[model samples]
Target: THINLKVSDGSSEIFFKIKKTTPLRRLMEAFAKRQGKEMDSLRFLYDGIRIQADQTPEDLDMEDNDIIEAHREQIGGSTVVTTESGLKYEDLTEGSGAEARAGQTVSVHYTGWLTDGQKFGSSKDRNDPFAFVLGGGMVIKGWDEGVQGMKVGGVRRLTIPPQLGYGARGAGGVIPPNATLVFEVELLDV
Candidate 1:
């Protein structure tokens, strides 16, 4: 049987017609390509459950007119990535100074949490700002890339996907596998 499926990514939606035997991967790849996005940058969910690439319409128990939600994929490679908005951040305080760059030693105080607002880690709690050499592997790949343009005394909220942070393997109990992390970071010294 053929099915008509709806996929949305908060901002927009696309409809697809496919055979039940067609793997979800094909549809996902098509959607990504149409959107000019990398396949790894997007994920699909149906009935609030993640959709696997190998699963087909029949496997998902989907009928015609099924709807799926598209979300930004958090799982990514350990290295820094620039594929679409892989690392998104907002600056709370606009500093009147130079932006942070690679090779500069910097200090920052940050608090990290899961999407559900569960606190995981915070340099503020310890009363010590985290210090590291810019572009060094001292921190997660997301922070390494995301903080590059920050100015001294600037505060930014960064949304880090799992791939940019720890990827599939989380950091012990602080984070779960394939988990997305939210952070409120303050650039203390640069």
Candidate 2:
């Protein structure tokens, strides 16, 4: 059997009819195409929770004439916070666990990139989360400061200046001297 679904982007709405077993991504793509927007630029939510692209109407127990809200994906918006040390951070996703504090052994997955957009390192590439004491000098100065107060499961983006980063020496052959760095860190455990 098939069901009718409506996708709304607050200002406009589009309707679609699809088989129950079909992936919702197809509908999302169709809507994006009709609206002249990129598929990845929008987020589909059902009942306020994000809906996976691979999920189907049956998987979500959706009924006919159900409505899915689509919102534009935001990167930084106006939520960026800058510190006195020239370090900036923005929380992309907030966590529900207790906030991390100094001396706590925190685990995180992160992808580091240079200001020029070249990828340097990533815990995700290794399929493992990196662990270190929150305030310890085990990591770069930026990470030591930026990662504090983050809760488990939170995703934060840190923009580090040269002073808080690898400094004038930089790291190995990947990062350049006096280079600014960006890292998207996901707090996994504490």
Candidate 3:
């Protein structure tokens, strides 16, 4: 069955008739084309949650005529604070000791990816654990915010939006503009 939906970016809007299993990314891309806007500069939200490229209408339990809001990005990140921040996280393994806080230097093993599961970088692949000072802006805003309170040996999966990761100005060559990112982070030392 075809689902009727509306996508809007405040200044303009577009309606679509698409299959239930149709990927939301295609719909957004078409809407972007029609609006003469780059998909990278816009973010889509359903039920206040950023829509992933791989998710379909059925995956979101979207109803007929559902309105997907497109908006300028906001600031914030983290899994435990997902309700307040758009950051989503899953704990693979629990960590130990005092939580990591601002000003503390940390070493971590991580692999980063686009929402589509395209791997961009990995400390493991390079055979090196990344080290940085927490909340130092040495890395993306997401890492600065998301890694706090994490303990050594903890493995976490972080879903970071463009605002928190690379924003509109993406990293050269490796990441695209306004892209959502996923990171598998293992806290090695603190």
Candidate 4:
């Protein structure tokens, strides 16, 4: 029998056949590659603590009904981040990031608005993570400098100057011709 797994709504599904034995290493490796990554870069799990990467499924002492989880490793490096918005945010979570850096995949949820409190864009309503590689040129200059060095879970407020945003031309409709951006950001995971 085949069991279907929903990797995510926008992503693919995972199908597994009932079997008495399947190599754990092979299974994890296959899962990692399916996710467009590498096995060595995976953080497989059973409960919460990490499962050894080299261990085989036969070595896990697990049964056919057991469940295993696959999580990508957080980017191992850090970088320097600066927010020209320069709005000092109070620490909401026990740990939060103060800057955005290179070589990191930062996931954030935010609500951005103009100085007049008119919202232009937001991840809040979407209720999904905005995942991007910092310094990867996947986002605007402001985001690259606004979310670095933050911990796994953190929140902050950034007041972006016009230059850091779209500037005079702006981002069209929602953003005014020359607007500074304000954001209440939640650093979900990285």
Sort order, lDDT high to low:
2, 3, 1, 4
Model 4 RMSD, rounded to 1 decimal: 13.3
Alpha-carbon shift of residue 108 in model 1 (angstroms): 0.5
- In model 3, pairs of residues that clash are none
For TM-score, candidate 2 versus 3, the one ahead is: 2
Off by over 4 Å in 1: 1-85
Which run of 10 residues does model 3 get worst, by summed lDDT?
72-81
Q: lDDT of model 2 at residue 101?
A: 93
- Worst-scoring 10-residue span by lDDT in model 2: 30-39
Give candidate 3's error at residue 11 in angstroms.
Answer: 30
lDDT of 1: 0.80
- For residues 63-148, write the lDDT of model 1, one tens digit per residue: 89989888764442222234365887766565658999999999998878777545688886779999999899888988888888
Give the Cα-based TM-score of candidate 1 against the true structure. 0.56
What would the per-residue lDDT of candidate 4 be over residues 1-190, giving only the tens digit for each residue?
2232222112233444433344456666666665444687656676554667565445555554556666544364322234445433333343544444688787888777666445677775677879999878777656666665556566555666667667788785778666777665777776
Q: What is the TM-score of each candidate against the true structure?
A: 0.56, 0.63, 0.57, 0.49
Best by lDDT: 2
lDDT of 1 at 45: 90
RMSD per candidate (Å) reads 13.1, 10.5, 10.9, 13.3
Show pairs that collide, candidate 1: 76-163
Better of 1 and 3 by TM-score: 3
RMSD of 2: 10.5
